[PDB]
């Protein structure tokens, strides 16, 4: 009873049903390193200017 | 004018060139720390992008 499987047929991508857990962490890496905290607030005027020698402004 | 004026006006003045002695020092010792531990907003060097690391099944397993 056995049908050769037509041109295409063998390529295609199946799904497969299995009772395997998932393995979460497969490439067994660390934690990645926290980001450099964030900085709030919104922008305010320079306090004196660029304070660059002796300009005022 | 009476001396009021001009010596409320040069305590304005070394007020304002006080607060900017401090903040010119604060910068240096804020830049050294930056520079040396990288944990601020300053002296990011680059790494590379990773969102051009392909995540795509291989033609092999082990990857
Ligand atoms: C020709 C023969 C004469 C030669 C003259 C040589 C001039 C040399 C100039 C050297 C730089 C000193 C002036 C720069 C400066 O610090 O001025 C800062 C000025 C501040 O503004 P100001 O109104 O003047 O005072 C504070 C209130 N904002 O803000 C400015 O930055 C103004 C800059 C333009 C200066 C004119």
């Given at each position: 009873?056995?049908?050769?499987?037509?041109?295409?047929?063998?390529?295609?991508?199946?799904?497969?049903?299995?009772?395997?857990?998932?393995?979460?962490?497969?490439?067994?890496?660390?934690?990645?390193?926290?980001?450099?905290?964030?900085?709030?607030?919104?922008?305010?005027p320079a306090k004196?200017?660029?304070?660059?020698?002796?300009?005022?402004? | 004018?009476?001396?009021?004026?001009?010596?409320?006006?040069?305590?304005?003045?070394?007020?304002?060139?006080?607060?900017?002695?401090?903040?010119?020092?604060?910068?240096?010792?804020?830049?050294?720390?930056?520079?040396?531990?990288?944990?601020?907003?300053?002296?990011?060097?680059?790494?590379?992008?990773?969102?051009?690391?392909?995540?795509?099944?291989?033609?092999?397993?082990?990857?």
């Open positions: 009873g056995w049908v050769r499987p037509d041109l295409g047929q063998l390529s295609k991508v199946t799904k497969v049903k299995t009772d395997r857990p998932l393995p979460e962490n497969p490439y067994h890496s660390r934690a990645r390193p926290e980001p450099n905290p964030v900085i709030e607030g919104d922008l305010k004196h200017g660029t304070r660059f020698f002796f300009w005022t402004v | 004018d009476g001396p009021e004026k001009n010596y409320e006006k040069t305590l304005a003045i070394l007020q304002i060139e006080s607060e900017k002695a401090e903040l010119r020092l604060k910068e240096q010792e804020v830049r050294r720390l930056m520079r040396a531990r990288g944990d601020g907003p300053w002296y990011q060097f680059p790494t590379p992008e990773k969102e051009f690391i392909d995540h795509s099944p291989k033609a092999t397993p082990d990857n």
